[PDB]
Design a protein around this nucleic acid. Structure first.
Ligand SMILES: [K+]
Ligand SMILES: [K+]
Ligand SMILES: [K+]
Ligand SMILES: [K+]
Ligand SMILES: [K+]
Ligand SMILES: [K+]
Ligand SMILES: [K+]
Ligand SMILES: [K+]
Ligand SMILES: [Mg+2]
Ligand SMILES: [Mg+2]
Ligand SMILES: [Mg+2]
Ligand SMILES: [Mg+2]
Ligand SMILES: [Mg+2]
Ligand SMILES: [Mg+2]
Ligand SMILES: [Mg+2]
Ligand SMILES: [Mg+2]
Ligand SMILES: [Mg+2]
Lengths: 82, 114, 80, 177
RNA sequence: GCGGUCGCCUCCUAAAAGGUAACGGAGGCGCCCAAAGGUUCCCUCAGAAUGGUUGGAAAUCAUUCGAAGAGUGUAAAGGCA
RNA sequence: UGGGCUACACACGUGCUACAAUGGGAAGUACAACGAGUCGCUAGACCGCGAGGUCAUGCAAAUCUCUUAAAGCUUCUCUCAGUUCGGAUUGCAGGCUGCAACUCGCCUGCAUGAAGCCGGAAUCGCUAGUAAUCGCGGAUCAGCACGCCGCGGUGAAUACGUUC
């Protein structure tokens, strides 16, 4: 998969927002279009409203969720059955 | 026998070890190399001391119930976080990016002609 | 006790293979190997790999590593 | 007899002290072990019951008594008097030997054995263990079993209270959860 | 006339002995059992709670409560632990 | 900017791989053609089990490279087994390309080993270097083919005849 040398990936604007909110007693929702961002241990404890193609779905971060792309946690399309 | 699974007796030792869950052809060759046992000799001819050494190698390995619990823990982990992968597991659909308009029988199951 | 209706029963010694902890108990199975025992008596022996003493629960210390969390895995992989 | 020796030597004084028993006669003890094997499959084929009986006999060392349905039940395709379910009663030396073997050998071999429950008490001081599967007893031979089956072992003691039963069973050796 | 009924057993009617009618109110019988008979010995139930693999309301097992609330081949009454 | 065209109870077409011994696995060994290459083809060497990474060479090319082709042939192993057939699905760990691989790429290692035992009604191509069968190149192209174009290797059976 992702080359180890390149290190983990995350959008700079999203990274800046989380860093500014790090010293926050109560984390506020972070509205992002960035599906590409990988989740980080620092990201733990936050709720991120990730765009799903038509709206930002909030998703809560936790230690288990770290290490995966944000966009995965927000399904794009809806299918109920036939 | 080795880890609680009666490996075939007449077959060659390499294939008999593969019959162990969690051990493929590559791992079987590796453990036989470690133990010094020839790959051709059948298990029914393998001496007890060879079996003890092979058991020691496998004990060092992680296989069978241990491996199944580990992999199922990962799948359970996906589902519990509720990832896209977890939902794929939940609904029995291809998780690695396959198309589903056709095929996908392996994950979906048998055809429902409706 | 009625005769000729019960399966055969005989005293048999047990040793924990992991530790060698030894105890005498009856059994229906028969072990070709026989060992001696205090009071100078020989009985069939059933070697046991997993016994009370061997199994981690009875000891109170568990061998398994409990796996590693993804946070720590990520830290290790990317040196963070 | 080892378990009996352990009881009389360690357990009896310990329980006497803990519960301040005026006379040693108050000491709770294991009265009997009733191993019950419920086999409804006997209705479909009595050979399942036969093999269950044979395996039970090998495990216990005594020929089991084949209980019968006291009442006909259509829900299970059951007819009154059908020989469904078996049991063995162990007392004295055989009781102690089987319990000791169960504690030492049988219990660890249970898959992912984290111990036995701690709430399975009748409320009077008698315990019952629901074994999910055989092959944990060394005599089962792990291959003769055409159908895997469990059982329900009932430890009946003279303890008036479940607490005394639990402590006695723990001291005798019981991996509660 | 049509329908019903015709012999035998049980209950109510039946008015605390017995008996007692109606095209009065309810049900059964035309067998069964080689033990479901005789005798000797032994035993006590139905259900409920609690606990318990398959197993679920409910199969089998255990403790406790439980005087009959079960069973008594076959209707009912009487009787029987 | 993000998402979709990649959905998915099912139906159909077109192909890829298989169901095994005329085979699979290990080792040895031999013979092509068509075409592509400047920031691209890339020799050799170091590291890596591998995908590849590092150093580095020649070549704008009948001059160097892609590129010692695969079936083949010769030995060893497997012995009729849903298997040492099968390689779906799935977990982990990697490689790359790219700002970016979750939606949603390819490839590799370990792990697993799905259906599948030659296929109903019917249906497709082909008269010879053809069918059948085996690899190789290329266009698109940062990355991505079981498709398409082309190339070469081995190499049949049958044509009685025009009734349908
Ligand atoms: K898809
Ligand atoms: K299709
Ligand atoms: K079509
Ligand atoms: K295709
Ligand atoms: K061969
Ligand atoms: K992708
Ligand atoms: K076909
Ligand atoms: K390409
Ligand atoms: Mg294996
Ligand atoms: Mg895809
Ligand atoms: Mg009167
Ligand atoms: Mg009267
Ligand atoms: Mg009678
Ligand atoms: Mg399309
Ligand atoms: Mg086959
Ligand atoms: Mg022609
Ligand atoms: Mg050709």
């Amino acid at each position: 998969g992702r080359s180890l040398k390149k290190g983990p990936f995350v959008d700079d604007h999203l990274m800046k927002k989380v860093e500014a909110q790090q010293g926050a007693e109560k984390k506020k929702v972070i509205k992002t279009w960035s599906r590409r961002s990988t989740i980080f241990p620092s990201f733990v404890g936050f709720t991120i409203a990730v765009y799903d193609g038509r709206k930002h779905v909030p998703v809560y971060i936790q230690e288990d969720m770290v290490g995966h792309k944000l966009g995965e946690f927000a399904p794009t399309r809806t299918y109920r059955g036939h | 026998r080795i880890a609680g699974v009666d490996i075939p007796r007449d077959k060659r030792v390499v294939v008999s070890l593969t019959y162990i869950y969690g051990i493929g052809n590559t791992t079987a060759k590796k453990v036989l190399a470690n133990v010094g046992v020839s790959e051709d000799v059948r298990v029914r001819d393998l001496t007890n001391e060879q079996t003890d050494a092979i058991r020691a190698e496998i004990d060092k390995l992680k296989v069978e119930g241990d491996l199944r619990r580990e992999v199922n823990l990962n799948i359970k982990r996906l589902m519990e976080i509720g990832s896209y992968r977890g939902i794929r597991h939940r609904r029995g659909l291809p998780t690695r990016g396959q198309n589903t308009k056709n095929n996908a029988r392996t994950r979906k199951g048998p055809t429902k002609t409706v | 006790m009625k005769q000729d209706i019960h399966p055969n029963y005989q005293p048999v010694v047990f040793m924990d293979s992991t530790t060698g902890f030894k105890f005498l108990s009856g059994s229906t199975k028969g072990s070709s190997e026989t060992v001696e025992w205090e009071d100078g008596n020989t009985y069939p022996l059933l070697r046991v790999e997993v016994t009370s003493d061997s199994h981690p629960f009875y000891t109170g210390r568990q061998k398994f590593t409990q796996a590693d969390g993804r946070v720590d895995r990520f830290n290790k992989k990317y040196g963070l | 007899n080892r378990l009996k020796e352990k009881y009389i030597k360690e357990v009896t004084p310990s329980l006497v002290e803990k519960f301040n028993y005026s006379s040693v006669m108050q000491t709770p003890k294991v009265d009997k072990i009733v191993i019950n094997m419920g086999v409804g499959d006997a209705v479909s084929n009595a050979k399942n019951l036969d093999k269950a009986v044979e395996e039970l006999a090998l495990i216990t060392g005594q020929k089991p008594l084949i209980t019968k349905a006291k009442k006909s039940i259509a829900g299970f395709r059951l007819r009154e008097g059908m020989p469904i379910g078996a049991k063995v009663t162990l007392r004295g030396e055989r009781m102690y030997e089987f319990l000791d073997k169960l504690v030492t050998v049988s219990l660890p071999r249970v898959r992912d054995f984290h111990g036995v429950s701690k709430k399975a008490f009748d409320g009077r001081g008698n315990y019952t263990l629901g074994i999910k599967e055989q092959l944990i007893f060394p005599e089962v031979d792990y291959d003769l079993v055409d159908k895997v089956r469990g059982m329900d072992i009932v430890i009946v003691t003279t303890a008036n209270t479940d607490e005394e039963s639990r402590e006695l069973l723990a001291q005798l050796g019981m991996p509660f959860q």
